[PDB]
C-alpha cells in the first residue's frame, strides 16, 4: 500500500519544490510505462512459445506411447504366429 | 513417431491377415 500514497503524500506538501518533484514523478511513470509497453511484446511472444513448447511435449510423449503400444501388438501378434508355427511343427513332427 | 506407430500398425495387420490365411493353409 505505501508506493501508491506517495503521490498523494507528495500533492500535499507546502515545499516550494513540489510542482518540480510532481512533474519528476509524470515523467517516471511515462518512462516506466513506455518501457513496459516496449518490452510486453517479447513477453507474450516467449509466453505464447513456452505454451508451444509444454503442447508439443505432450503430442511428442502421446506419440512415443502410441508406437510403443504398437509395437507391443506387433509383437504379440508374431509371438501369436511363431506359436501358430509350434502349434503345426509338433503335428509335422508326429 | 506416430507414422511409425501407424506402420507398427500395418504390419501388425498384415501378419495377422498372414495367420488368417497360414490357419486354412494349414486345414
Same mark, same amino acid.
Given at each position: ?24 514523478? /509524470?515523467?517516471?511513470? *511515462? @518512462? &516506466?510505462? =513506455?518501457?513496459?509497453? #516496449?518490452?510486453?511484446?517479447?513477453? /507474450?511472444?516467449?509466453? *505464447? @512459445? &513456452?505454451? =508451444?513448447?509444454?503442447? #508439443?511435449?505432450?503430442?511428442?510423449? /502421446? ?32
Amino acid at each position: 500500500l505505501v508506493p501508491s500514497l506517495v503521490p498523494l503524500m507528495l500533492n500535499d506538501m507546502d515545499s516550494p519544490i513540489t510542482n518540480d518533484v510532481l512533474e519528476a514523478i /509524470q515523467n517516471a511513470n *511515462a @518512462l &516506466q510505462q =513506455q518501457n513496459a509497453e #516496449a518490452n510486453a511484446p517479447y513477453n /507474450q511472444q516467449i509466453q *505464447a @512459445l &513456452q505454451i =508451444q513448447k509444454l503442447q #508439443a511435449e505432450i503430442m511428442e510423449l /502421446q506419440a512415443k506411447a502410441h508406437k510403443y503400444a504398437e509395437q507391443g501388438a506387433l509383437s504379440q501378434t508374431t509371438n501369436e504366429s511363431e506359436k501358430i508355427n509350434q502349434a503345426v511343427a509338433i503335428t509335422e513332427m508326429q
